Write a protein that binds this ligand. Structure first.
Ligand SMILES: [Mg+2]
Ligand SMILES: [Mg+2]
Ligand SMILES: [Mg+2]
Ligand SMILES: [Mg+2]
Ligand SMILES: [Mg+2]
Ligand SMILES: [Mg+2]
Ligand SMILES: [Mg+2]
Ligand SMILES: [Mg+2]
Ligand SMILES: [Mg+2]
Ligand SMILES: [Mg+2]
Ligand SMILES: [Mg+2]
Ligand SMILES: [Mg+2]
Ligand SMILES: [Mg+2]
Ligand SMILES: [Mg+2]
Ligand SMILES: [Mg+2]
Ligand SMILES: [Mg+2]
Ligand SMILES: [Mg+2]
Ligand SMILES: [Mg+2]
Ligand SMILES: [Mg+2]
Ligand SMILES: [Mg+2]
Ligand SMILES: [Mg+2]
Ligand SMILES: [Mg+2]
Ligand SMILES: [Mg+2]
Ligand SMILES: [Mg+2]
Ligand SMILES: [Mg+2]
Ligand SMILES: [Mg+2]
Ligand SMILES: [Mg+2]
Ligand SMILES: [Mg+2]
Ligand SMILES: [Mg+2]
Ligand SMILES: [Mg+2]
Ligand SMILES: [Mg+2]
Ligand SMILES: [Mg+2]
Ligand SMILES: [Mg+2]
Ligand SMILES: [Mg+2]
Ligand SMILES: [Mg+2]
Ligand SMILES: [Mg+2]
Ligand SMILES: [Mg+2]
Ligand SMILES: [Mg+2]
Ligand SMILES: [Mg+2]
Ligand SMILES: [Mg+2]
Ligand SMILES: [Mg+2]
Ligand SMILES: [Mg+2]
Ligand SMILES: [Mg+2]
Ligand SMILES: [Mg+2]
Ligand SMILES: [Mg+2]
Ligand SMILES: [Mg+2]
Ligand SMILES: [Mg+2]
Ligand SMILES: [Mg+2]
Ligand SMILES: [Mg+2]
Ligand SMILES: [Mg+2]
Ligand SMILES: [Mg+2]
Ligand SMILES: [Mg+2]
Ligand SMILES: [Mg+2]
Ligand SMILES: [Mg+2]
Ligand SMILES: [Mg+2]
Ligand SMILES: [Mg+2]
Ligand SMILES: [Mg+2]
Ligand SMILES: [Mg+2]
Lengths: 115, 72, 184, 212
RNA sequence: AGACAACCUGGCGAACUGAAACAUCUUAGUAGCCAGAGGAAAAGAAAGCAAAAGCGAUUCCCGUAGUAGCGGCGAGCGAAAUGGGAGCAGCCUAAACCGUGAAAACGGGGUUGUGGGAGAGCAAUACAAGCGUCGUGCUGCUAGGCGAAUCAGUGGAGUGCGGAACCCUAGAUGGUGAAAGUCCAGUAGCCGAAAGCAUCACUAGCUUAUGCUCUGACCCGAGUAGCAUGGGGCACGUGGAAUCCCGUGUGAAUCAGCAAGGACCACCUUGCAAGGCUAAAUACUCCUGGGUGACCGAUAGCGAAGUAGUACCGUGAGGGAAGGGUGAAAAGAACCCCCAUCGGGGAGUGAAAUAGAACAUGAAACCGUAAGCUCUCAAGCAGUGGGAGGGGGACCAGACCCUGACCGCGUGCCUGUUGAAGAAUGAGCCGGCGACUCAUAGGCAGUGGCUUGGUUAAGGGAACCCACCGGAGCCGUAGCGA
RNA sequence: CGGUAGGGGAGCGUUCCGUGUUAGGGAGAAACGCGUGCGUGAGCCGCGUUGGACGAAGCGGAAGCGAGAAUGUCGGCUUG
């Protein structure tokens, strides 16, 4: 019994093609390239989601460090964290970084409660 | 109907089977130049002996109609 | 009906699928079909002869031939249909029955075929017999005579097949037969 | 034994009841023994008519079209290669003998346990060969209606001998299928919705497929 | 006379290859060439197998058995008897002698193996067996005929749907605007042949044809067998090498004999060479009729679904393509405008013209039009995680899709390597075709059946499948030893 | 519970056959094109101003069965 390839190669490649919507040039038009790039996109996505966690953290240190140098001279981020664990606080970088922008008056009180 | 497995006769003339299924051979070196050999050495070669475990893969592949038992 | 064309199926573990090599890597056997990189075992054709050892003298040449088989001496085959004494006890015979080839084939113990058909019957004597029946066999071993005669059985050795003898050969035997007979 | 079959007459009334005690495979494997006997019935039935042509059997070829080198193109040995249209076929089908072997006692056991399962949807009838002096499908259908059957669904009549007047009265119907001990098969038993027997077949069927 | 696909017979007769080289060997008495012949051919009616018990022409299948053996004892090659089935058929001549002839020759006589004929003498020899030309019928083939049962509605068409009926010895197929047991052709069943062919039966009348004693007198297929030598082929490579067939040279015997039984001798058994014919079982398909497909459906299937072995190429042998689908029905588009044609726009046809002929469903690469966001201080395997500003929609909206100011990260894919983004290999792109399969055996595992040990093979089997037979054989029940 | 060669285990899908003149289908099948749905994934389930007649699922079976590469290959179409 003879069996043509049929349509399984077509319906497969449409799923591979639909993922390549906004790609420029021949990376959205040629099947032998979209399969070559669709592989690369997910690896880059799986890699970024691991880097996604360290990146926002890296941004929160700057914002918290940037928002606290104004209070005291010869004072800095590293001294602020050492006092929280001394005072037995639990707040993380996410909450402190967002309060620094959204309710800056709170950190001025947190600095006072520590001292 | 058609093709049947053939026995490798040069191997059949050099290997046989015991009652349980052990393969055996004759030890070599007892056809010429026996004077320089001691009776202890010539006695060792005269006796039969079981064939090495590693070589059955070649013997059985050549002797398909040769009943054996690998578990003994 | 309970059973029907659309409610049957095989027993699990009885009908495996079968490896279709060369149909991707996730299937298990890869594109190379499980033969590694380029070599001789990976080629499309007959391989090395079983026993070949890369030019080294194989084991079927550096070993002498069996005794007798080397020159052409014929191997010794069975001359009789051996049956031990214990098997007769299991057959379930009574005082009156005999023991021959035709009797045992009826029970199903002895089932010869081909070469084994044209053989007599021999008794060996490994067992015990406590039924006191008669025998119609060809030959007997030493232990069998001691056991059967002790059990009150009735043995009967058959004459077997005759061997043709040249005329003058009978006279030399008759010469010796007359010699021993007249003296003893 | 457990489900005694009732007997019917040429009319729609009852006259008695009997049973049939056949050899049945155990429930742990009866579903598989019947399925093994069903494949071989069909795998022996199929005909190896598929055939193709290899590169040696296809017409043409033989000549090397262009030399091995000094040409900027992939090597080639013959135009009638599988890697070109109109060429050979790699490992294509050929006329095959699909026939396999199955032990008798397995095929016989698969047949017994199948009939022993259709007891709840079967029954027995008396002889009616004399009631048909001439072939007539109209009267034959009326008899099935009076016995409680539907010609729309499948059915099965198993009897000793199919006389001429009776076999012509069901030869035209597609659903109804008449059988004899020689024409008895496994395929028809499982396909039929309702079975029918006679006093002679219950005797013949019990002795050939007893439980002793 | 020549032609004739394959099978068959005869003659000549390779090589690559395998042996991991190669010459003995294998490939192989294959391929191909030549010759011949038939629907089959060839073989074939014991100078035979066998072994002390028996079989009774040849051929084919199962099995014996991958056994006994052969073999640089390497690769590899490979029996036979017994047994089980298919299918069964046995006949005509030379010679002794008697007549006819110068001879050659004609007629009669005879044809066998526990020996038979001739020869003579007795009987009784042949009706019932095998043949069978005039022709006479039987049955089939080569043209055909009869042949049961339905109406309406469903908006292109009703065989479908819903509803109501009918036939069936006919629910096999194909066709019909759309899928049919009841519309058509048909099928079941029945009928039918002047003429021709074939299978059978009958019929001439000549026809081949039936037994007991006497004899060890006359015949038993000659340049043959055998031997010596050189070779071939038998499973068996000169080996102890028989058996069978040839070249050279030699060269027997006639039943009181000869050959064979694996050197040879002896004994016994079996058989009667040197003349010939013969049906069936068996092998093949350029073809014919019927039937069936877990066969293909226009890159498939025969190379060929169209003027295919055409077009085209080649001095020639020879090689060798491609091109399928309007519609139920051409009703193939009157007429008007553009108009030199082609072609297009309306009209009209049609269920559909956005089916309009270069016309059926019409994917992708590729070439484009329009709309929404958007780039001219940039830099980058082109994306990804963040997501400014703007835009969008039958569900809703803290959602979703499109666009992407700017930051960060990120060294194409396979192949294959100690290691490749690699300036190592391969791919111009898209789509299709395209690769561990098949048969038969060995071993192992899993599952199943039987275990009162198991199982059949060929071969039969309502066409096959299949019910039921078929136990010959094979495996397992004693090993040790050359 | 990283993993190449390589081995084992469990599954998806294609075309065809059995149930099958199946269910369903000019009240629009196959196909094609789509999707705020589901799954570990191969894929499934659904939708339609396309299409115009076929044909699942389920329990099972068989293969000319899954392509991105072979200076592959046929046809079509680009670049220059
Ligand atoms: Mg971390
Ligand atoms: Mg043993
Ligand atoms: Mg792997
Ligand atoms: Mg690959
Ligand atoms: Mg492997
Ligand atoms: Mg490779
Ligand atoms: Mg290797
Ligand atoms: Mg090779
Ligand atoms: Mg080999
Ligand atoms: Mg060496
Ligand atoms: Mg031995
Ligand atoms: Mg060729
Ligand atoms: Mg050639
Ligand atoms: Mg082809
Ligand atoms: Mg001629
Ligand atoms: Mg050669
Ligand atoms: Mg070689
Ligand atoms: Mg070589
Ligand atoms: Mg002819
Ligand atoms: Mg004929
Ligand atoms: Mg014939
Ligand atoms: Mg002939
Ligand atoms: Mg002849
Ligand atoms: Mg004469
Ligand atoms: Mg009619
Ligand atoms: Mg109607
Ligand atoms: Mg008819
Ligand atoms: Mg003679
Ligand atoms: Mg010889
Ligand atoms: Mg001789
Ligand atoms: Mg001898
Ligand atoms: Mg003889
Ligand atoms: Mg073609
Ligand atoms: Mg097409
Ligand atoms: Mg269209
Ligand atoms: Mg078109
Ligand atoms: Mg600048
Ligand atoms: Mg700018
Ligand atoms: Mg290197
Ligand atoms: Mg490596
Ligand atoms: Mg490169
Ligand atoms: Mg390099
Ligand atoms: Mg280079
Ligand atoms: Mg390149
Ligand atoms: Mg390519
Ligand atoms: Mg391609
Ligand atoms: Mg393919
Ligand atoms: Mg393939
Ligand atoms: Mg292989
Ligand atoms: Mg096997
Ligand atoms: Mg078992
Ligand atoms: Mg059979
Ligand atoms: Mg048959
Ligand atoms: Mg792992
Ligand atoms: Mg780990
Ligand atoms: Mg389809
Ligand atoms: Mg239509
Ligand atoms: Mg189905």
């Amino acid at each position: 019994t003879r069996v043509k390839r049929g349509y399984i190669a077509r319906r497969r490649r449409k799923k591979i093609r639909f993922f390549a919507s906004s790609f420029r040039g021949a990376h959205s038009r040629l099947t032998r390239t979209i399969a070559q790039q669709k592989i690369r996109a997910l690896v880059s996505a799986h890699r970024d989601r691991d880097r996604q966690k360290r990146d926002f953290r890296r941004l929160w240190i700057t914002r918290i460090n940037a928002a606290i140098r104004e209070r005291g001279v010869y004072y800095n981020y590293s001294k602020f964290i050492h006092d929280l664990y001394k005072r037995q606080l639990l707040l993380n970088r996410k909450i402190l970084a967002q309060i620094a922008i959204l309710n800056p008056n709170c950190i001025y009180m947190i600095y006072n409660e520590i001292i | 109907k058609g093709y049947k497995m053939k026995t490798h006769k040069a191997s059949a003339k050099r290997f046989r089977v015991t009652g349980k299924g052990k393969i055996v051979r004759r030890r070599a070196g007892k056809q010429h130049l026996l004077a320089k050999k001691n009776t202890k050495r010539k006695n060792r070669l005269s006796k039969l002996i079981q064939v090495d475990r590693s070589d059955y893969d070649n013997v059985i592949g050549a002797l398909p109609y040769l009943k054996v038992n690998r578990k003994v | 009906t309970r059973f029907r064309l659309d409610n049957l199926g095989p027993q699990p573990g009885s009908r495996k699928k079968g490896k279709r090599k060369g149909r991707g890597h996730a299937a298990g056997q890869g594109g190379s079909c499980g033969f590694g990189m380029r070599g001789q075992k990976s080629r499309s054709g007959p391989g090395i002869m079983r026993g070949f050892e890369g030019g080294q003298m194989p084991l079927y040449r550096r070993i002498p031939k069996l005794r007798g088989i080397a020159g052409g001496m014929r191997a010794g085959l069975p001359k009789y249909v051996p049956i031990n004494l214990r098997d007769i006890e299991v057959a379930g015979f009574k005082e009156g029955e005999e023991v021959s080839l035709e009797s045992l084939k009826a029970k199903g113990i002895i089932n010869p075929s081909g070469r084994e058909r044209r053989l007599p019957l021999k008794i060996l004597g490994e067992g015990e017999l406590s039924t006191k029946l008669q025998i119609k066999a060809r030959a007997f071993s030493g232990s069998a005579k001691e056991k059967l005669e002790a059990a009150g059985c009735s043995v009967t050795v058959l004459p077997g097949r005759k061997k043709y003898i040249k005329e003058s050969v009978r006279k030399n035997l008759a010469r010796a037969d007359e010699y021993f007979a007249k003296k003893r | 034994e457990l489900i005694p079959l009732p007997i019917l007459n040429f009319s729609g009334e009852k006259v008695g009841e009997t049973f049939l005690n056949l050899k049945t495979a155990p429930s742990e494997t009866a579903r598989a023994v019947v399925h093994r006997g069903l494949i071989t019935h069909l795998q022996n039935k199929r005909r190896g008519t598929a055939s193709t042509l290899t590169r040696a059997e296809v017409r043409g070829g033989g000549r090397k079209p262009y030399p091995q080198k000094k040409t900027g193109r992939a090597r080639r040995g013959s135009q009638r290669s599988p890697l070109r249209p109109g060429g050979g076929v790699i490992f294509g089908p050929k006329p095959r003998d699909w026939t396999i072997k199955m032990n008798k006692k397995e095929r016989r056991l698969a047949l017994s346990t199948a009939i022993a399962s259709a007891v709840g949807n079967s029954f027995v009838v008396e002889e009616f060969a004399e009631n048909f002096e001439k072939p007539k499908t109209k009267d034959f259908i009326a008899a099935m209606q009076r016995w409680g059957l539907d010609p729309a669904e499948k059915s099965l009549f198993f009897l000793m001998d199919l006389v001429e007047n009776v076999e012509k009265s069901g030869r035209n119907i597609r659903t109804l299928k008449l059988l004899t001990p020689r024409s008895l098969n496994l395929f028809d038993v499982l396909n039929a919705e309702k079975l029918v027997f006679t006093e002679g077949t219950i005797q013949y069927l019990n002795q050939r497929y007893g439980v002793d």
